[PDB]
């Protein structure tokens, strides 16, 4: 409903949006991630990861280094505000997070951390 969004990552390393708006009065927000296509998780897995704009580089750098078995996220990374798990084609995962984690006027970015994906699979998240 108003406090959720559906996003897709496909076999061509595309998310289907580059901008998410969250109603600032939502108590929680949910992202429902899915993966059209047929490529398996070990080839074309995707996740959905939220951080500040400033933290994204570091999250991506350490995430890509962390490997498939760690969903390409640094374990215990305090910069990651919220994340789904890593999913392959035909799979689905949802994450819910507390909108009080987020500041009106702050610049947030969502992105996919797997090797080769983050520059191609990113966007803004902003409160309205
Ligand atoms: Cu991806």
- Domains, in order of start, for the chain: 1-128 (2.60.40.420)
DSSP category for residue 120: T
Q: Which structural technique was applied?
A: X-ray
The reply, when asked if residue 121 is annotated as ligand binding, is: yes
- Taking the centre of ligand 1 as the mean of its atom positions, its distance from the CA of residue 30, in whole angstroms, is 19
Final resolution, Å: 1.6
Torsion angle of C-alpha atoms 22, 23, 28, 29, degrees rounded to 10: -30
Which token pair is 80?
Answer: 């990651």
CA distance 100 to 98: 5
Identify any residues that bridge with 62 across adjacent strands, giving them in sequence order: none
Nearest CA among 112, 101, 106 for reference residue 126: 106
Within 1-126, residue ranges assigned H as helices are: 41-44, 53-65
Q: What is the secondary structure of 71-91 as a DSSP string?
A: TTS-TT-TT--EE---B-TT-
The answer to whether the annotation marks 83 as part of a ligand binding site is: no
Ligand 1 mean position, distance from CA 15 (Å): 8
Q: Residues 125, 48: contact at Cβ < 8 Å?
A: no
User: Which of helix, strand or coil describes residue 104?
Assistant: coil
Report how far ligand 1's centroid is from the alpha carbon of 124 (Å). Answer: 16
Name the DSSP letter for residue 108.
Answer: E
């Amino acid at each position: 409903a108003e406090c959720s969004v559906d996003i897709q990552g496909n076999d061509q390393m595309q998310f289907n949006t580059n901008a998410i708006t969250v109603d600032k009065s939502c108590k929680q927000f949910t992202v429902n991630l899915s993966h059209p296509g047929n490529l398996p998780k070990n080839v074309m897995g995707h996740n959905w990861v939220l951080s500040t704009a400033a933290d994204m580089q570091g999250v991506v750098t350490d995430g890509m280094a962390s490997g498939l078995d760690k969903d390409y996220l640094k374990p215990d990374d305090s910069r990651v505000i919220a994340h789904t798990k890593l999913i392959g084609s035909g799979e689905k995962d949802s994450v819910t997070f507390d909108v009080s984690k987020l500041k009106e006027g702050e610049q947030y970015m969502f992105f996919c951390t797997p090797p080769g994906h983050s520059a191609l699979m990113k966007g803004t998240l902003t409160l309205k």
